[PDB]
Amino acid sequence: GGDLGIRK
Amino acid sequence: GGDLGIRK
Amino acid sequence: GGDLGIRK
Amino acid sequence: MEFLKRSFAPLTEKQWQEIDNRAREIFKTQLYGRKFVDVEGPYGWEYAAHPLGEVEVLSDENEVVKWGLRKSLPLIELRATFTLDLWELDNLERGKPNVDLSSLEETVRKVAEFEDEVIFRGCEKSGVKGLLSFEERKIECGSTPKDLLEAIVRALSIFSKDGIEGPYTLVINTDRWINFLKEEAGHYPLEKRVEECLRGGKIITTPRIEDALVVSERGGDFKLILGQDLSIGYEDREKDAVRLFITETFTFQVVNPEALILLK
Amino acid sequence: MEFLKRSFAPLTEKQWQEIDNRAREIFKTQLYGRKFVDVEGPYGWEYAAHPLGEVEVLSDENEVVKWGLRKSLPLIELRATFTLDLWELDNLERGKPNVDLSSLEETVRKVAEFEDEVIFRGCEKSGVKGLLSFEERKIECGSTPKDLLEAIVRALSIFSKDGIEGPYTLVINTDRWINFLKEEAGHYPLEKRVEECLRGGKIITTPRIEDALVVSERGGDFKLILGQDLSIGYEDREKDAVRLFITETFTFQVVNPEALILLK
Amino acid sequence: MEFLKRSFAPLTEKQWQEIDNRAREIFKTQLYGRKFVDVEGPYGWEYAAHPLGEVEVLSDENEVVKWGLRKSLPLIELRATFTLDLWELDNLERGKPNVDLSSLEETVRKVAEFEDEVIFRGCEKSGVKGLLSFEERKIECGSTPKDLLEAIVRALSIFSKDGIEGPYTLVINTDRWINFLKEEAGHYPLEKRVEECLRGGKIITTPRIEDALVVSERGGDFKLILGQDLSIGYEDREKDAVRLFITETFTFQVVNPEALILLK
């Protein structure tokens, strides 16, 4: 798959 | 409640 | 896969 | 639905549902739009715009982080208020079978007219291209019974070359159909010959367009997109009357225009 | 099927099958050939020729080991390439309902036209005698409604004496049929009178022939012989577009010509 | 996620995740925006606009069916392409520990800068009012250590009268903080005196603003609204290099501005 996944 | 509910 | 699949 | 603050209206059970049923009866036969396009189930009172699925480039090649906006299609909220006489609806409880709610009947029809307008020509203001604006899908049609049959079959043939096929439907001006029924007066029913040349299709007469229209109801070509479907709520009380209203939230898009053919 | 190197095209699931479905919808109503001939299930991507079942004598009585070749009927491979805008099919994923793939729509139709051509007149180059080349099975027909009915019943009678009987079908020029529908304007539906005089047969209008045609769909008289059926594959990537194609492998033979009647 | 057509890039497992990790490392410390606002979990690649929850009246009292549009807040899509040397990433497989992907490092940072720009001043074009555009929430601040402490406590007091209270945070220009650290050179750590006057708050130095900023991270006052979160995909192959990219889909709104205090 893909995405990257950051989020604070 | 509410609404009316039509949709063909 | 592939193909398309028509035939009457 | 909590927001149409219906619980706060000075109205009985019998009263509320008597109002509801009246409006339901009219909308059912007067929302000519919905008789042949499909509806996309209520997305919710707060749905604000339906995504169109494109970008709006807004950057030079001078910028490294190129970017744009996502085209959406904002929904119209409408709100048609009207007044009903309290000491008259009270009469429903005294026994009165027909209560005088013509105030409502009209309001309903006007909301109906509204929606059809947007389905048929659209609000440019809202970004929706109506049905009749699709010029490329216009063909010429006569005025004889024979000229109509001809039109139909030529239409069914434009569809045939686009792969477009559902059941086929004839939308048609009410008075125009009275006129075709003039010359086809008891030789053989026009109704059945049109329905035959449509391959088992149906015919909808309507006072919302002036000419004629042919679509396939194979589905997924004419989305009416509902947010909050047609509902009735309560606004306020004016001494000896009640002010209710009629809200809706919606938009519309012609997806596959090739399922559409306009006439003369 | 592995060779249509589809896995190597820069396309999503949604994307591939959205391309496939579009082509399938058109092929279904535009392969007029298949609507009434029968198809011989896919023999395989490598099937090279369909045996005709004769010998080609090639020896004098001067030779002792007499001999010849076996007449076969080599299949046509066709390959119709076309281009689609990548950063536009990408839009399918952004949400866009109708993606602009008219580049494909046309290519499909042209492949359709091609096959019909071979079924109706054949490639002399490939050894296939088309449908209309069977002169011996031509009869004269008028231009009235009445003249057609006449034709039909006379046809049903040429069959009757060859033992040929299935359901019967009327293949007929699209415009020609609009013309017979002129004089038969609401006395009684031509549709049903033709279907009746055909003994419950059907009627196919088509822009592939200029006159008319009558066959029995009893089967096994008009073999369309498929090797690899109509498929879509991937050829290459042109910077900002994709080059897909449409392949097929086939031939055609009219087995029992007496199941065929040509018109005026 | 299928659309970032990553499977089609000529890269190994090791390679892909080596690229990913590098970008993740940078984004984590360079997305100064997200260090103190909250994020609204990915709504999906096709989310087009975030509802604002208002109507845009568009009708006279001349019309009976009054109506308007629903204010939404369209999301920016951004796409920052960049190139990497293939025969160099190949080296990762040969054993090479640090592979030269500075081409990527920069692109990442530029995307980072972009987002912060929108959080901090907004694109007028997109409809988002940046953080610093809230003039009513500006107060004057000195340049001594003592002048800062003063600012803080006066701020904590404007919050106190709006009911606004979370843990409190100091966003502050990197260089400006070096300067306050000049006069507070080993009498007692400024770090701790600020954190104390903030009531256990934290301090974020940043090169994204020139002055200072105070917020409460109590939450739900500064929504960064994500559609598809920051991802890497594959665009194409340029002979001996690969063109990847960095997409995102988002917008931003300052909900409760009273959780915000700007400085000198």
Domains of chain F, by residue range, sit at: 1-131+217-254, 132-216+255-264
For E173, the enclosing helix (H) or strand (E) is: strand E168-173
Residues of C in contact with E232 (CB under 8 A): 2, 4
State the binding site of D for FMN.
79-81, 87, 90-94, 235
Other Cβ atoms closer than 10 A to E125: 8
Among chain D, residues having any CB pair with chain F shorter than 8 Å are 46-53, 55, 58, 64-72, 74-81, 107, 110-111, 113-114, 125-126, 227, 249
F76 burial (CB, 10 Å; 0-12 / 13-18 / 19+) is buried
Out of 3.10.129.10, 3.30.70.240, 3.30.2320.10, 3.40.640.10, select the CATH number for domain D132-216+255-264: 3.30.2320.10
Nearest by Cα to D213 from D264, D158, D154, D255 = D264
Nearest by Cα to E84 from E19, E21, E12 = E19
Nearest by Cα to D113 from D78, D75, D74, D73 = D78
Other Cβ atoms closer than 10 A to E245: 18
Q: How far is CA F139 from CA B1, F150, F158, F163, in A?
A: 49, 11, 10, 19
**E200: Cα within 13 Å, side-chain hemisphere:** 3
Question: Taking each helix axis from N to C terminus, what angle separates D13-30 and D86-94, rounded to the nearest 10 degrees?
Answer: 110
Q: What are phi and psi of F15, to 5 degrees?
A: -55, -60
Pair E42, E226: CB distance under 8 Å: yes
Residue carrying the six token digits 């300052």: F254
Residue E245 and residue D165: Cα distance in Å, rounded? 25
Q: DSSP 3-state assignment of F197? A: helix
Residue E168 and residue E206: Cα distance in Å, rounded? 17
Q: Which residues pair with F254 in a beta bridge?
A: F222
Residue carrying the six token digits 């009684």: E188
Pair E29, E38: CB distance under 8 Å: no
**Token reading at F256:** 């409760």
Q: Nearest CB to A3: which of F1, F34, F39?
A: F1
Residue E236 C-alpha from the chain's centroid: 29
Looking at the complex, report in whole angstroms how far the Cα of residue C6 sits from the nearest Cα belonging to chain E: 7
Q: DSSP 3-state assignment of D86? A: helix
Residues of F in contact with A3 (CB under 8 A): 1, 229, 231
Residue E186 and residue D186: Cα distance in Å, rounded? 9
Contact E229 C1 (CB under 8 A): no
**D213: Cα within 13 Å, side-chain hemisphere:** 29
A4 burial (CB, 10 Å; 0-12 / 13-18 / 19+) is buried
Residue F203 and residue F185: Cα distance in Å, rounded? 18
Contact A8 F232 (CB under 8 A): no
Looking at the complex, report in whole angstroms how far the Cα of residue E164 sits from the nearest Cα belonging to chain C: 21
Contact A2 F24 (CB under 8 A): no
Pair D78, F67: CB distance under 8 Å: yes
D179 burial (CB, 10 Å; 0-12 / 13-18 / 19+) is exposed
For D222, the enclosing helix (H) or strand (E) is: strand D222-226
**Token reading at F11:** 């890269």
- Resolution (Å) of this entry: 3.1
State the amino acid at position D251 in one-letter form: T
**Token reading at D125:** 């203001």
Residue carrying the six token digits 């007067």: D30
Q: Which residues pair with F49 in a beta bridge?
A: F74
**Token reading at F119:** 């959080």
Residue E117 and residue E88: Cα distance in Å, rounded? 33
Contacts of E24 by beta carbon, 8 Å cutoff, 6+ apart? C4, C5, C6, D163
Pair F104, F23: CB distance under 8 Å: yes
Our CA dihedral for E130, E135, E136, E139, rounded to 10 degrees, sits at 110
* Residue E63, marked binder: no
Which residues in chain E are immediately followed by a break of C to N over 2.5 Å?
none
Pair E232, E6: CB distance under 8 Å: yes
Nearest by Cα to D227 from F167, E53, B7, F146 = B7
Contact F49 D46 (CB under 8 A): no
Residue E107 and residue E81: Cα distance in Å, rounded? 8
Residue D140 and residue F135: Cα distance in Å, rounded? 62
Residue F51 and residue D49: Cα distance in Å, rounded? 7
Residue carrying the six token digits 């081409």: F103
Pair F169, F201: CB distance under 8 Å: yes
CATH of domain E1-131+217-254: 3.30.2400.30
Contact F39 A3 (CB under 8 A): no
Contacts of F257 by beta carbon, 8 Å cutoff, 6+ apart? F134, F136, F137, F221
E239 burial (CB, 10 Å; 0-12 / 13-18 / 19+) is exposed
